[PDB]
């Protein structure tokens, strides 16, 4: 199931759960999110939400950066979505000819 | 960080150990240890001589340390004064037959570790770091080397952005084992930190 690392930061089970809830957006696609991995970090610049997920047709790797941690967490999601959606439909592009 | 140390890499091919001796299973760790404390003292004082090697020879509770160096007089002393005052200081540490010699160096500008401290020094003198390096390689080629490559790292000129400058000239084939390339490192201090001056002198291939 799903894992989260808070690198050189202290975070709460609240904050963790929200992150659970956020990755859910991906569930839409109805493919398997296998051992998703979220890593949250603080740069000088603002925070960073990393993610690496294997699904039956490939992996998601992403990085969101923002002054707001939550915003960074979302940007992470925006990138992941895109990747996954392209993962699920790059197939269909070449059906004919 | 990729590159191999070009001296550890020629050891017993084009460059021979800075310590030649055997010592047994039971002694080596202490034997080597003096050689180290010996070199600290020696390099500590003999900086001002411009020393480029400290050899240590041993047989049986006695050692002949050869010092090769740029300006031998500073080591020798007042008409013979320091040299022994050091064999004195020496076997204070050594406690055995500390037989100190000297050697002169024909060209300090064809001895790498020298060229290195020189330009390392210049930067502490608040000098123009691009130009220093430019000249170091420029002097070493006028001094006849087959190749030359000086390399400075760190907050150059004082910058907040750690930068890494270098120039080189002729050939400096670090991949070649038969090529003799002298390498020497000087670590320069400034008010804002450490800059890493590396020197590469290719002298000739056997």
């Amino acid at each position: 199931t799903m894992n989260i690392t808070s690198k050189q930061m202290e975070i709460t089970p609240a904050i963790r759960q929200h992150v659970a809830d956020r990755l859910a957006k991906l569930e839409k696609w109805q493919t398997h999110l296998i051992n998703p991995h979220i890593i949250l970090s603080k740069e000088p610049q603002g925070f960073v939400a990393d993610a690496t997920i294997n699904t039956p047709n490939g992996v998601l790797v992403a990085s969101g950066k923002h002054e707001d941690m939550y915003t960074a967490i979302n940007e992470l999601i925006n990138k992941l979505e895109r990747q996954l959606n392209k993962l699920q439909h790059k197939g269909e592009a070449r059906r004919a000819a | 960080g990729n590159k191999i140390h070009p001296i550890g890499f020629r050891l017993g091919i084009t460059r021979d150990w800075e310590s030649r001796w055997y010592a047994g299973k039971k002694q080596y760790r202490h034997l080597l240890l003096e050689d180290q404390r010996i070199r600290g003292l020696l390099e500590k004082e003999l900086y001002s001589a411009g020393l480029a090697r400290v050899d240590i020879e041993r047989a049986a509770d006695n050692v002949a340390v050869t010092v090769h160096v740029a300006k031998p007089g500073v080591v020798i002393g007042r008409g013979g004064e320091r040299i022994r005052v050091l064999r004195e200081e020496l076997a204070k540490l050594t406690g055995k037959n500390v037989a100190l010699n000297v050697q002169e160096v024909q060209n300090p500008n064809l001895s790498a570790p020298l060229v290195a401290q020189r330009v390392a020094e210049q930067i502490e003198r608040r000098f123009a770091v691009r130009r220093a390096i430019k000249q170091a390689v420029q002097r070493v080629m006028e001094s006849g080397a087959k190749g030359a490559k000086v390399i400075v790292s760190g907050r150059i000129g004082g910058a907040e952005q750690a930068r890494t400058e270098w120039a080189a000239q002729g050939r400096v084939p670090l991949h070649t084992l038969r090529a003799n390339i002298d390498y020497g490192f000087a670590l320069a201090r400034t008010t804002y930190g450490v800059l890493g001056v590396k020197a590469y002198i290719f002298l000739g291939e056997v």
């Binding site: 269909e92 059906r95 004919a96 000819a97 | -």
Partner: protein, 155 residues
């Protein structure tokens, strides 16, 4: 790999029959590199297919081979938007290789207790034309035939 085609490894003929084919079949019985153990079993089996059927183990062996060599097979190849079962003839080389593999495999799928026995029996049934090995062979050939349709999609 990419560049030039690989070379067929040459086997050292076995020190009982001197047959190149026999060698391969032993090594297919070989597990963990313990070759002698595997060598034992092949011969063990011949002991059985000599007594249990009164003539040359060897001859029976090469028949079980010709009777498990599959001639046409399918090789999946996506055309357009569907994965097609494409019919193709098995290279001579590969008929052997396969027919070997299936022989042993079919065997280990058996209830008689020593490996020594099964390799005999399977090699017995398959030599005539019966046997779980042939069942794999027979099947592989129907798959080819049924799909005769998609055979201009051969490469």
């Amino acid at each position: 790999a990419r560049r030039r085609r690989a070379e067929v490894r040459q086997l050292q003929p076995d020190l009982v029959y001197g047959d190149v084919l026999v060698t391969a079949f032993i090594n297919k019985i070989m597990r963990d590199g313990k070759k002698n153990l595997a060598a034992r079993i092949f011969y063990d089996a011949c002991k059985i297919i000599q007594e249990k059927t009164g003539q040359e183990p060897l001859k029976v062996f090469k028949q079980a081979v010709e009777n498990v060599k599959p001639r046409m097979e399918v090789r999946s190849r996506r055309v357009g938007g569907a994965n097609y079962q494409v019919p193709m003839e098995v290279s001579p080389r590969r008929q052997q290789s396969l027919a070997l593999r299936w022989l042993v495999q079919a065997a280990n799928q058996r209830p008689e207790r020593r490996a020594a026995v099964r390799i005999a029996h399977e090699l017995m049934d398959a030599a005539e034309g019966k046997g779980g090995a042939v069942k794999k062979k027979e099947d592989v050939e129907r798959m080819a035939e049924a799909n005769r349709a998609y055979a201009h999609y051969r490469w």
